[PDB]
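Dear colleagues,

As part of the handover before I leave the project, I'm documenting each prediction I ran so the next person doesn't have to rerun anything. This entry is a single chain, and its sequence is reproduced below.
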Amino acid sequence: GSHMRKKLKAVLFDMDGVLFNSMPYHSEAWHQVMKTHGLDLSREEAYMHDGRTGASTINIVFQRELGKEATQEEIESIYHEKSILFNSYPEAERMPGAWELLQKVKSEGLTPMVVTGSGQLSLLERLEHNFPGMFHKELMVTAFDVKYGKPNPEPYLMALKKGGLKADEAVVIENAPLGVEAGHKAGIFTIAVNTGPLDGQVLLDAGADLLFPSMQTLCDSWDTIML
């Protein structure tokens, strides 16, 4: 009721496909790097790995394709090449609606947080430049913070702890099924934003409490939702 909305203290955003329009790039880079290394990973499957750490993504692709674990050397080497390729494209731009929403969130007195499986320093160091005054490194969870990462609730549990928050004081904004699942398993109200080429149903099946087709529509409906 009025209780749910009034409990809110923080809004926890994924980065890729939520704040930055970076998913076409990640999909392309993952596909290409695996191809060079000798492994089949489609752009569609690469999309569906959104949320995981680079290390987890690589290990899981190795499991699925070769039926074995990647070594640490393979993880480091492939991740380096993935990063070179990703950074070779014209730098990813803001997702339309993201900045407008963040302004609404801040004006409501809520704390923005980033919870991401990313270790891409280019993107992470561009958060301040793209969303000025919004985020703080002490109020972010990245690949550097976690042992497991999404879909494990771990990164979202860590975010609640960093923010001094209980689960009912936060909302999660996610584009990815594995990220929705992590937020849901951490016990947090989760809003799915279907910014990729996915069936919106898979985000609902992952445990999303609300579904929107874009960040802009979420932004437009922000004052309306949660009673």
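The longest helix spans residues 23-37. The longest strand covers residues 111-115.

All the best with the project,
I.
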